[PDB]
RNA sequence: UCUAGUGGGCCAUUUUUGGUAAGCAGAACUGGCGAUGCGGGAUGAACCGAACGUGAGGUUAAGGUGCCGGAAUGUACGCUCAUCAGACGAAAAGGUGUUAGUUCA
RNA sequence: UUGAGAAGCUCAGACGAGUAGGCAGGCGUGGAGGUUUGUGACGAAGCCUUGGGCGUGAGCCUGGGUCGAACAGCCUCUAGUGCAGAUCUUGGUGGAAGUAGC
RNA sequence: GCGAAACCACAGCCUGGGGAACGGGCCAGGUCGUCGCAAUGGUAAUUCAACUUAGUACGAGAGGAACCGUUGAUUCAGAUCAUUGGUAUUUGCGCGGAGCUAUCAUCUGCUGGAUAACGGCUGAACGCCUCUAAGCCAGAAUCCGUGCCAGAAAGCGACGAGGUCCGCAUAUGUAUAAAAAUAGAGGUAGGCUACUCUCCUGUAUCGUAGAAGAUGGGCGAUGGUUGAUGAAACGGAAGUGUUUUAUUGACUUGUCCAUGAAAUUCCAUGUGCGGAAUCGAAUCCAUUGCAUACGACUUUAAUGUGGAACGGGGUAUUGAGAUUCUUUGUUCCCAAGAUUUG
């Protein structure tokens, strides 16, 4: 409690990591998303050589306490216009996408079964009935805005999570002109983007998230820094946990699924270290506020071998498949 | 509607007072347009009223008036001392008063 | 002299204390006062002088930095804020930075008893409230100093249109013979 | 002629003696408070005005007239810009800090 | 001109702090002698009341409500005659508090 | 359920002063949600230490820069709990699942300006000179912001989703929008000017007739004000208003006439509540530990790929056996009821 930077200690209400500071953008920067929401799949340690000038282990293999984060491709389903005002940054108008999933529409409804599930139903009506109104809203944003952010909802359905309400986060498109940001979001309306597009995995991502509730112990949003990604493995990729050295195919999901999360089916990001918040928690992977040029960021990741020993429970093998012939024929 | 208002606008500033003693029997009135004690000599003896409205429709009307007269100038800036038939309420500080042109000597 | 229901004051070049005392007396007189361009107020004394005054104030309370909040504090100290009369008078004051849209299309007056050019001796150092606020915590200086040109450009265009429109009646004035036929009345 | 009550002090001023690091203490004197409310002094037991039946009107005292706060953001002539102004001993000095003048020149 | 409760009426001027203390005039209570050829079941006394009035005041008169058997003004006599205090007496009732607790 | 007593002048937020405490009491001050902005605070990493970078330039040499990464570590902060240690009613089989705690498995703690001293540039005073006097730059472990932690239970913006019956009570002309400085500006023909003009406050400009503003005849202009709608543009800072109108009607004070004004015979001047039949939403609720003295909080139960419990199985545990997230199986549950407002 000595550091008053985190004192007083109070639990953060929103489970989703909130981007209190988005990265600065300029017209020279190409239009791109700055944040991508992920889920705490796991954080087993995997070996990787370190090619770093002056490293005591220069060109030497190192087991690293990395972290796999399930990242279902985010869907942009709306935009918000932010007008620069002498009293702060105000939301000019919000232009949603015409059609919304039940999951994101469920987010608004506390119960979702109540009577009619009317989320944006008339809004979907007036959207199609009067597209010109949306055109004027887009025109108003392009004419009277400086900060354009996009409404994005989580594809929890791909993830093995009971929660149905899609987490909605207001990711900010960065770079280019305001009209370019509106145009990108408009053409991307009701469309999903993988984190592999948002982050290149060589980029240093200051993932932020809410610390878990210890039982005011814990439950506080925190911003990790200096966390370069190591492998943005896609879900369709079954070679994601198989590097060049361990060429043998192995899914990122280890034996016995994941601890209190289940298997990974969608894209994931590999990153060394640990982050606040329990397993399968919505984690805000976001662009680094500072363009830090540390040699750790400069050096590339050349992952030696992905640990896939058993999740919840105990496993002494990388995958059962090799263990099948490794052990003698079972009684079965 | 600029064919009315035979009166002059005025404001009820305060009562006559020292630093710590107030005298509600005489009120200090700022007639607008009057900017010195020599111009305040024109409005001496003129009828001044406070016009307000109350909830009850007594007399079949919604408006009631407290009448008064201007006695003497106050200070150098053209404020005047007015004595009303009933002492003006302290809540009417900064309220508006009407200074007629009668009794006229012009 | 005469009062209006709402008086809009352009605080550019007005001394803080002189304007606040005039405004406070007008508020107690039963008038609604709006002060725009509160970031353009001037204070006698060099930059370091009121810097230490405000820095000492920071040492002391809810420290406000915005220029209007500085002016609002100055006016409040000149009011009987411990009584209902003082509180009611305070609520009739609306101090803002810049000129918001409801007020940029309304006439703005100035207080000669508070103007710097008529009260401060030439060659005396002065500290603008907006500049002084910018380094003590206020962070909206750049964006309001950028938007003013947009307001000025629009207002300048309006004045040119009004002046061009006025030229027609001005020419038509001397064109009509009755203007000079009965101009012996001084009109 | 008799006939109730009191047989202190405080604020101190002034004159004044001794002083003694220096303050301070000791006499007399002077009045006031003590039995006395009121205007002022931001507030104030002793500072400036003024001493009191109930009221109306007028006019003042001491203090004041940017706002709080009643009353000129009055007039005229000067000093100062203090980043610890001013408004109410560290003080000796230092001021390539000044404003006016005097002397010698 | 009636304006002789001569203890009345009238005219004038000045003055107005006040502890201890001194001196006048009054208000109220219980009882007594006299008086009002007094008040009262068609409602005495008491009590209540954001009703009205009188007096500088102590106090007094009165309307309404309640109530149910006695009571008052004036002149004089008399005294167990007037309360916010006494860590006052007696009685009643509060906050603590539905708390400490059983 | 029963049930006290002590105590009680009276209220009760702080910083200064009120001289005799002054204080406590004086004076002067301090509908439901979605997704976001930030008034205001707090702040953190302190870092070095040891091998290169080094026996490095420079230094006769010794000493030792600049220098560059890495490896770690002193202390303290927020933490994940993957993997591992412990685990510990799996009461499954000492082990010990599912998960928790523990760096005992691991993350893990920011960065750009302005400046102090000092050092300079410009340059007077004091023809030069002079960091300084007008000023500027460099420059501290300093300061300010940035980043982080929160947010203002009564701080706000965008965004999605109360209405109908019954009863009852019933200001005076609100007229005026460039900016800018006084070592001055505005605009100015002409083609960047040149020079003139204007100020020298609004005592101005706009409007101002009508028995509170009538009825008519009109006339001049054949048009200024407006009402009513149909409208399109512009306005984002809090646009909520600026116009453009298309007409439809009027007053038209533009002007000239005819009627009416009086015994006021001298001033007094739909909206709200209380009920219902309704439509949604939220809470309780099936709930749950995510939260937990209790409050209060978070998820899931509305006719379905529904949720939940079993029959189980997987995962691992275990070390031939058993157990427990998952299940195209079965059934329960079911348009799941009340409360609350809108």
Q: Which residues contact A75 (CB under 8 A, 6 or more apart)?
A: A101, A152, A153, A155, A190, A191, A192, A193
User: Same domain, yes or no, for C96 and C146?
Assistant: no
Residues B37, B75 contacting (CB under 8 angstroms)? yes
Nearest-10 crossing angle of helices C16-28, C67-77: 60
Burial of residue C186, with CB atoms counted within 10 A of its CB: 0-12 exposed, 13-18 middle, 19 or more buried: exposed
Residue B54 backbone dihedrals phi, psi, to 5 degrees:
-130, 160
Same domain, C90 and C5: yes
Beta bridge partners of residue B28, listed in sequence order: B14, B81
Read out DSSP for A195-239? Answer: HHHH--SSSBB--EEEPPB----B--EEE--S-BEEE---SS-SS
Whether A328 CB is under 7 Å from strand F:
no
Give every CB contact of residue C65 below 8 A, 6+ residues apart in sequence: C133, C136, C137, C138
E strand segments, chain A: 32-33, 35-42, 46-50, 60-64, 66-70, 74-85, 88-96, 147-153, 168-174, 191-193, 208-210, 221-223, 229-231, 268-272, 282-286, 302-305
Phi, psi of C155, rounded to the nearest 5 degrees: -65, -40
Say if residue C157 is in the same domain as residue C117.
no
| Chain C residue whose CA is closest to B79 | C1
Task: Tell me how far apart the alpha carbons of residues A68 and A30 are, in angstroms, rounded to a whole number.
Answer: 28
Q: What residues does C44 pair with on adjacent strands?
A: C126
Backbone angles phi, psi at C54, to 5 degrees: -75, -35
Q: Is C55 exposed, middle or buried (0-12, 13-18, 19+ CB in 10 A)?
A: exposed
Kind plus residue range of the DSSP H or E element containing C33: strand C32-36
The candidate with the shortest Cα–Cα distance to C103, out of C171, C163, C151, C71, is: C151
Q: Is A13 exposed, middle or buried (0-12, 13-18, 19+ CB in 10 A)?
A: exposed
Q: Would you call A20 an interface residue with chain C, using a CB distance cutoff of 8 Å?
A: no
Contact A188, A76 (CB under 8 A): yes
Are there at least 3 beta-carbon pairs closer than 8 Å between B and C? yes
CB-based contact A36:A71 (threshold 8 Å): yes
Note the strand D nucleotides within 7 A of protein beta carbons: 39-41, 43, 56-58, 65-74, 81-85
- Nucleotide F24 C1' to residue C60 CA (A): 25
Q: What is the spatial distance between Cα A227 and Cα A204, in angstroms, rounded to a whole number?
A: 6
Q: Please tell me the distance from the alpha carbon of residue B75 to that of residue C43, in angstroms, as a whole number.
A: 31
**Helix, strand or coil for residue A28?**
coil
Q: Which two tokens stand for residue B41?
A: 């000599």
Q: Which chain B residues in 30-59 sit with Cβ < 7 A of strand D?
A: none
| Residues C124 and C171 grouped into a single domain | no
Question: Three-state SS for C29?
Answer: coil
Mutation target among C29, C89, C91 for the B interface, most CBs of B within 10 A: C29
Do C91 and C155 have their domain in common? no
Calculate how close chain C gets to A175, using CA atoms only, in Å: 20
Strand, coil or helix: what is A66? strand
* Closest-approach nucleotide to residue C22, Cα vs C1': D67
Same domain, C170 and C117: no
Query: Residue A251: which residues within 8 A CB-CB, separation 6 or more?
Result: A238, A240, A241, A263, A264, A308
Closest C1' nucleotide to A21's CA = F147
- Beta-bridge partner residues of A184: none
Q: Which of A85, A86, A90 to mutate to test the interface with C (most CBs of C within 10 A)?
A: A86
Q: Is B1 exposed, middle or buried (0-12, 13-18, 19+ CB in 10 A)?
A: exposed
| C-alpha A251: how far from chain center | 19
> What DSSP designation does A37 have?
E
- State which H helix or E strand residue C68 sits in: helix C67-77
Q: How far is CA C115 from the centre of its chain?
A: 10
Q: Which residue of C has its CA nearest to A146?
A: C143
Under 8 Å between Cβ of A299 and A228: no
User: Cβ of C120 < 7 Å from strand D?
Assistant: no
C-alpha distances in angstroms, A50 versus A58, A296, A300, A329, C52? 6, 10, 9, 40, 54
How far, CA to CA in Å, does A235 sit from each of A200, A266, B15, B92?
Answer: 16, 4, 84, 77
Whether C9 contacts C33, CB under 8 Å: yes
Exposed / middle / buried, residue B52 (Cβ in 10 Å: 0-12, 13-18, 19+) = middle
Contact C120, C69 (CB under 8 A): no
Burial of A58: CB neighbours in 10 Å, binned 0-12, 13-18, 19+: exposed
B95 → closest Cβ in C1, C2, C30: C30
From the list B90, B83, B100, B97, the residue with the least C-alpha distance to B10 is: B97
Same-domain pairing of C26 and C103: yes
> The tokens 């263990």 sit on which residue?
A323
Q: How far is CA C42 from CA B5, C53, C133, in A?
A: 41, 15, 12
Q: Do both C80 and C58 map to the same domain?
A: yes
Domain that holds residue C2: 1-141
Which tokens belong to A66?
A: 């990395």
Residue of C nearest to A87 (CA): C140
- The Cα–Cα gap between A313 and A141 comes to 53
Same domain, residue pair C152 and C67? no
Number of helices followed by number of strands (H, E) in chain B: 0, 6
* Letter string b/e over residues B60-86, b meaning 16 or more CB atoms within 10 A of that residue's CB: eeeeeebebebeebbeeebbbbbbbee
Number of domains in chain C: 2
Cβ-defined contact of C147 to A87 (cutoff 8 Å): no
Which residue is the nearest neighbor of F235, CA to C1'? C101
The sheet that has C6-10: what strands, in order across it?
C6-10, C32-36, C93-95
The nearest CA of chain A is from the CA of C97 a distance in Å of 8
Question: Tokens at residue A194, please?
Answer: 């993988």
Is-contact A201 A232, C-beta < 8 A? yes
Mutation to test the A interface, candidates C36, C140, C151, most A Cβ within 10 Å: C140
Determine the distance between B3 (CA) and F215 (C1') in angstroms.
21
Q: Which DSSP string corresponds to A156-195?
A: TTTTT-S--SPPEEEEEEESS-HHHHHHHHHHTTTEEE-H
**Other C-beta atoms lying within 10 Å of the C-beta of residue A198:** 23
Contacts of B93 in chain C (CB under 8 A): 28, 30, 85
**CA–CA dist C162, C38 (Å, integer):** 27
User: Exposed (0-12), middle (13-18) or buried (19+): which is A116, by Cβ within 10 Å?
Assistant: exposed
Q: Which of C54, C42, C38 is nearest to C14 (CA)?
A: C42
Contact A134, A95 (CB under 8 A): yes
Q: Are residues C119 and C156 in the same domain?
A: no
Q: Which two tokens stand for residue C128?
A: 């603008």
User: What is the distance, to the nearest Å, from the Cα of residue A247 to the centroid of all Cα atoms in its chain?
Assistant: 27
Rounded Cα gap, residues A318 and A248, in angstroms: 11
Tell me how far apart the alpha carbons of residues A311 and A289 are, in angstroms, rounded to a whole number.
34
**Backbone region of residue C17 per phi and psi (left: phi > 0; alpha: psi in -120 to 50; beta: other values):** alpha
Q: Residue B74: which nucleotide is closest by CA–C1'?
A: D71
Q: Is A241 exposed, middle or buried (0-12, 13-18, 19+ CB in 10 A)?
A: buried
Cβ distance C85 to B93 less than 8 Å, yes or no, reads: yes
Q: In what order do the strands lie in the sheet with A46-50?
A: A60-64, A46-50, A302-305
Q: Do residues C75 and C103 share a domain?
A: yes
Rounded distance between C-alpha atoms, residue B59 and residue B31, angstroms: 30
| Chains with ≥3 CB–CB distances under 8 Å to B | C
CA dihedral (A312, A317, A319, A324) positive or negative? negative
Residue A84 in contact with partner chain C when CB distance is under 8 A: yes
Smallest CA-to-CA distance from A151 within A164, A135, A165, A169 is with A169
- A176's CB contacts (< 8 A; 6+ apart) are A27, A29, A30, A31, A184
A315/F69 CA-to-C1' distance in Å: 39
CB atoms under 10 Å from CB of C23, counted, come to: 28
Structure tokens at C20: 């606040």
Cross-strand bridge partners of residue C35: C9, C95
| B59–chain C nearest CA distance, Å | 30
Contact B93 C1 (CB under 8 A): no
Q: What is the resolution of this structure in A?
A: 3.0
- The Cα B98–Cα B79 span in angstroms is 14
d(CA A105, CA A126): 17
CA-CA-CA-CA dihedral for B99, B102, B103, C1, to nearest 10:
40
Claim to verify: residue C136 and residue C147 sit in the same structural domain: no
Q: What does DSSP say about strands A74-85 and A191-193: parallel, antiparallel, or unpaired?
A: antiparallel
Query: If you search the block for the tokens 């190591």, which residue do you land on?
Result: A230
CA–CA distance, C21 with C39 (Å, rounded to integer): 18
According to DSSP, the residues that pair with A69 across neighbouring strands are A40, A269
Answer whether C30 sits within 8 Å of B33, measured CB to CB.
Answer: no
């Amino acid at each position: 409690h000595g550091s008053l930077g985190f004192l007083p200690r109070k639990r953060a209400s929103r489970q989703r990591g909130k981007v209190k500071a988005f990265p600065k953008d300029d017209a020279s920067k190409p239009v791109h998303l700055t944040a991508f929401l992920g889920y705490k799949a796991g954080m087993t340690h995997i070996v990787r050589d370190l090619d770093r000038p002056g490293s005591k282990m220069h060109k030497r293999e190192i087991l690293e306490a990395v972290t796999v984060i399930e990242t279902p491709p985010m869907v942009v389903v709306g935009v918000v216009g932010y007008v620069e005002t002498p009293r702060g940054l105000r939301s000019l108008t919000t232009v949603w996408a015409e059609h919304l999933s039940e999951e994101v529409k469920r987010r608004f409804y506390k119960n979702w079964f109540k009577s009619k599930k009317k989320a944006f139903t008339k809004y979907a009506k007036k959207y199609a009935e009067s597209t010109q109104s949306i055109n004027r809203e887009l025109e108003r944003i392009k004419k009277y805005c400086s900060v354009v952010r996009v409404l994005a909802h989580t594809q929890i359905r791909k993830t093995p999570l009971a929660q149905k309400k899609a987490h909605l986060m207001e990711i900010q498109v960065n770079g280019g002109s305001v009209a370019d940001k509106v145009e990108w979001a408009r053409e991307h309306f009701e469309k999903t983007v993988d984190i592999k597009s948002t982050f290149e995995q060589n980029e240093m991502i200051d993932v932020i998230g809410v610390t878990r509730g210890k039982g005011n112990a814990g439950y506080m949003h925190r911003t990790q820094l200096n966390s370069k990604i190591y492998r943005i493995g896609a879900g369709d990729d079954a070679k994601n946990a198989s590097t060049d050295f361990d060429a043998t195919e192995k899914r990122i999901t280890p034996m016995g699924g994941f601890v209190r999360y289940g298997v990974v089916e969608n894209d994931f990001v590999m990153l060394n270290g640990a982050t606040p918040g329990p397993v399968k928690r919505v984690l805000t992977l976001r662009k680094s506020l500072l363009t830090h040029t540390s040699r750790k960021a400069l050096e590339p990741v050349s992952l030696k071998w992905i640990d896939t020993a058993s999740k919840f429970g105990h496993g002494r093998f990388q995958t059962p498949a090799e263990a099948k012939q490794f052990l003698g024929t079972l009684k079965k | 509607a600029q064919g009315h208002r035979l009166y002059v606008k005025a404001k009820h500033l305060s009562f006559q007072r020292s630093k710590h003693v107030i005298h509600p029997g005489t009120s200090i009135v700022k007639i607008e347009g009057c900017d010195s004690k020599e111009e305040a000599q024109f409005y001496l003896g003129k009828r001044v009223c406070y016009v307000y409205k109350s909830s009850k429709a007594v007399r079949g009307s919604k408006i009631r008036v407290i009448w008064g007269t201007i006695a003497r100038p106050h200070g150098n800036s053209g404020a005047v001392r007015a004595r009303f038939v009933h002492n003006l309420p302290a809540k009417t500080f900064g309220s508006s008063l009407r200074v007629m042109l009668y009794p006229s000597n012009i | 002299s005469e009062f209006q229901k709402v008086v809009v004051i352009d605080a550019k070049g007005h001394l803080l204390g002189r304007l606040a005392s005039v405004v406070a007396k007008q508020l107690l007189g039963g008038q609604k006062v709006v002060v725009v361009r509160c970031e353009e107020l001037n204070i006698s004394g060099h930059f370091f002088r009121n810097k230490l005054k405000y820095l000492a104030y920071l040492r002391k309370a809810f420290h406000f930095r915005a220029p209007s909040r500085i002016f609002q504090k100055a006016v409040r100290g000149m009011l009987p804020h411990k009584t209902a009369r003082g509180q009611a008078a305070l609520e009739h004051l609306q101090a803002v930075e810049g000129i918001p849209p409801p007020f940029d299309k309304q006439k703005r007056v100035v207080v000669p008893a508070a103007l710097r050019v008529l009260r401060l001796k030439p060659g005396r150092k002065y500290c603008t409230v907006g500049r002084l606020s910018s380094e003590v915590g206020w962070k909206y200086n750049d964006i309001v100093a950028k938007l003013e040109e947009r307001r000025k450009v629009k207002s300048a265009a309006f004045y040119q249109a009004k002046l061009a429109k006025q030229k027609k009646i001005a020419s038509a004035k001397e064109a009509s013979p009755v203007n000079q036929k009965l101009s012996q009345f001084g009109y």
